[PDB]
Amino acid sequence: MSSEPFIVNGLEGPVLASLGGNLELSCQLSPPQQAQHMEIRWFRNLYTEPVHLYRDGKDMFGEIISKYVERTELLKDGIGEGKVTLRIFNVTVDDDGSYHCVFKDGDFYEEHITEVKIT
């Protein structure tokens, strides 16, 4: 009974960062595809309006990543290895709560709560 689409690997994610500096967000996935054309959401914000989903390497106006300004670099080069690395600049003491890591493998989707830590 193969009902396993794609899953997450590793841990929830205790990601450590420095305020104003660079936040390297790391998520591990085990998809059936290379996930290059897949959709990912790797951010934290309050209420469903900003931070929705960024896809294929293309931004989404309705996702408005402009919420974290132009300080966003989603390393998708790793995605073929099952790793996504979001470099977000200027982490804050409110932002270091739990980052919402969401992976969308075509029709499949998985969730993860990455607890940030300002060290």
Structural domain range at position 36 = 1-119
Give Cα separations from 12 to 22, 106, 109, 116 (angstroms).
20, 22, 16, 10
Give Cα separations from 55 to 12, 26, 52, 65, 94 (angstroms).
22, 17, 10, 12, 26
Q: Tally the C-alpha atoms within 13 A of residue 42's C-alpha that lie toward its C-beta.
A: 28
CA distance 56 to 35: 9
Give the CA-trace dihedral at 74, 48, 11, 17, to 10 degrees: 60
DSSP for 50-103, written as a single string: S---EETTB--TTT-GGGGTT-EEEE-GGGGGTEEEEEEE-B-TTTTSEEEEEE
Say if CB 28 and CB 82 are below 8 A apart. Answer: yes
CA distance 109 to 115: 20
CA distance 26 to 39: 16
Give the count of domains, the chain: 1
CA distance 109 to 55: 13
Give Cα separations from 79 to 2, 41, 109 (angstroms).
23, 13, 15
Residue 64 maps to which CATH number?
2.60.40.10
CA distance 33 to 114: 23
Say if CB 64 and CB 77 are below 8 A apart. Answer: no
